[PDB]
Design a protein around this nucleic acid. Structure first.
Ligand SMILES: Nc1nc2c(ncn2[C@@H]2O[C@H](COP(=O)(O)OP(=O)(O)NP(=O)(O)O)[C@@H](O)[C@H]2O)c(=O)[nH]1
Ligand SMILES: [Zn+2]
Lengths: 113, 50, 311
RNA sequence: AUUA
């Protein structure tokens, strides 16, 4: 029995861009985790097709980091809506265990294709 | 200062390990032998290779 | 009547299948083995007691037992379909044991079984546990493993202080006979990780799902993702296996001409001292999916923890 | 593993 994160995690909200300050209002289903020391996001989802940048606000507001993203992946989802496409991203430097956590939770709690 | 210069110039930047300077430029060799069985396997005869 | 002699020829496959039961009928077999557990209420690396397995040893031409077993287990119906799907996705890898899914009735009902073919008696976790929890009062597993692979003979243990390192320094030569097995296991692990990444499967790799030949099985805790976006988790595996890599000297074959133990040694020039590319090649060959930056020269490290990690 |  070596499971990949039984107790799951919660939440997805906020913003994104492509050239530093291009993050205007909200262009990301920035996914998961509010750790015990503070809010630390793990996964990013994009109904758009090309983004390299984002800006997640937290706590002080003045401290909101211009995160560097990585080349995306694409998949289609089995939502009740029907045809729905996003382009997946992870925050750069995210270790293997965290990506496994978010992928397993996303695939096993909500239906995808 | 001729063998040392000959092996220094072959180096790609002038740096060489210290453990190979006596191994390739020394003129004299000293061997310490515990017993006869070891002697007949290392320096038997009048000339040997090492 | 029937059952035992019909389950025997149903487990018996299509290749040669000269099988003999391990003192059972149609019931399971109970053993005492080491596992690596994490299931939200228990955790650790200890020796539990296996319960649901039937084992059949295999014979050969001269009717003498060999180191090959057929392990068949029974469980629910959903795990049957899940494991069948994952195996169907992963069956073409040359580092995956050959599975066989069938259905057989023990009563008026029909229950499903999963049979694995040509495994060994002990896994890698058994070897790691035996070497990391040594006790000269009872070390039967280590002795059995040493004698079944021609590392020594059964009369080597009639000596006293045969295990000591200061007295009898020949135990180092005795231990250094498993290095090639360990190296082949590492290569097969890298192959399995590549296959998992290409097939789009997410899972965590443990030491008790690999036998001493390198083959992998037990896809019961895996999930599915889009192809090309798989990710294996290999932290505990490498971290627990690390101390055994130097005891058995697993990387001895890398000093020969073609990584072959039957060819002469490599002849480096005496003026070479960098070796910065060989270290990277070795890391990429044996530790490909270990995800943490590696600095061959510790002058580029970020702090003392990174210095320890790279050293 | 002791969830089969
Ligand atoms: N290799 C081998 N293992 C055996 C044998 N007999 C019993 N076992 C034990 O049976 C266990 C098989 O468990 P298995 O369900 O296949 O994998 P698992 O590690 O329990 N994880 P999960 O089933 O939740 O996915 C192994 O850990 C092994 O130690 C044998 O003859 N050969
Ligand atoms: Zn470092």
């Amino acid at each position: 029995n070596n499971e990949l994160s039984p107790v799951a995690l919660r939440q997805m909200s906020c913003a994104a861009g492509t050239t530093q300050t291009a993050c205007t209002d909200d262009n990301a289903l920035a996914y998961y985790n509010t750790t015990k020391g503070g809010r630390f996001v793990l996964a990013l989802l994009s109904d758009l097709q090309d983004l390299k940048w984002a800006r997640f606000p937290k706590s002080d507001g003045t401290g909101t980091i211009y995160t560097e993203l990585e080349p995306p992946c694409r998949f289609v989802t089995d939502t009740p809506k029907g045809p729905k496409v996003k382009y997946l991203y992870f925050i750069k430097g995210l270790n293997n265990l965290n990506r496994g956590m978010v992928l397993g939770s996303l695939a096993a709690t909500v239906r995808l294709q | 200062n001729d063998a040392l210069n000959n092996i220094i110039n072959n180096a790609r930047d002038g740096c060489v390990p210290l453990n190979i300077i006596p191994l390739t430029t020394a003129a004299k060799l000293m061997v310490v032998i515990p017993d006869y069985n070891t002697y007949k396997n290392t320096c038997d005869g009048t000339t040997f290779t090492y | 009547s029937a059952d035992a002699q019909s389950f025997l020829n149903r487990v018996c496959g299509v290749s040669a299948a000269r099988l003999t039961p391990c003192g059972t009928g149609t019931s399971t077999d109970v053993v005492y083995r080491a596992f690596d557990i994490y299931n939200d209420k228990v955790a650790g690396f200890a020796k539990f007691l296996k319960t649901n397995c039937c084992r059949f040893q295999e014979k050969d031409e001269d009717d003498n037992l060999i180191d090959s077993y057929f392990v068949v287990k029974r469980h629910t119906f959903s795990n049957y379909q899940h494991e069948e799907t994952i195996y169907n996705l992963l069956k073409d890898c040359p580092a995956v044991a050959k599975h066989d899914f069938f259905k057989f009735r023990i009563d008026g009902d029909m229950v499903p079984h999963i049979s694995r073919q040509r495994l060994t008696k002990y896994t890698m976790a058994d070897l790691v546990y035996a070497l990391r929890h040594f006790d000269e009062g009872n070390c039967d597993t280590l002795k059995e493993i040493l004698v079944t692979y021609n590392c020594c003979d059964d009369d080597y243990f009639n000596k006293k202080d045969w295990y000591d390192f200061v007295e009898n320094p020949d135990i180092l030569r005795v231990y250094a006979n498993l290095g090639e097995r360990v190296r082949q296991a590492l290569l097969k692990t890298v192959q399995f990780c590549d296959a998992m990444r290409n097939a789009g499967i997410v899972g965590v790799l443990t030491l008790d799902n690999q036998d001493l030949n390198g083959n992998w099985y037990d896809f019961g805790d895996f999930i599915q993702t889009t192809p090309g976006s798989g990710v294996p988790v290999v932290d505990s595996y490498y971290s627990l296996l690390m101390p055994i890599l130097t005891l058995t000297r697993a990387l001895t074959a890398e000093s020969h001409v073609d990584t072959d133990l039957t060819k002469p040694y490599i002849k480096w020039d005496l003026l070479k001292y960098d070796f910065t590319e060989e270290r990277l090649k070795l890391f990429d060959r044996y530790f490909k999916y270990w995800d943490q930056t590696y600095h061959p020269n510790c002058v580029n490290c970020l702090d003392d923890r990174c210095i320890l990690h790279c050293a």
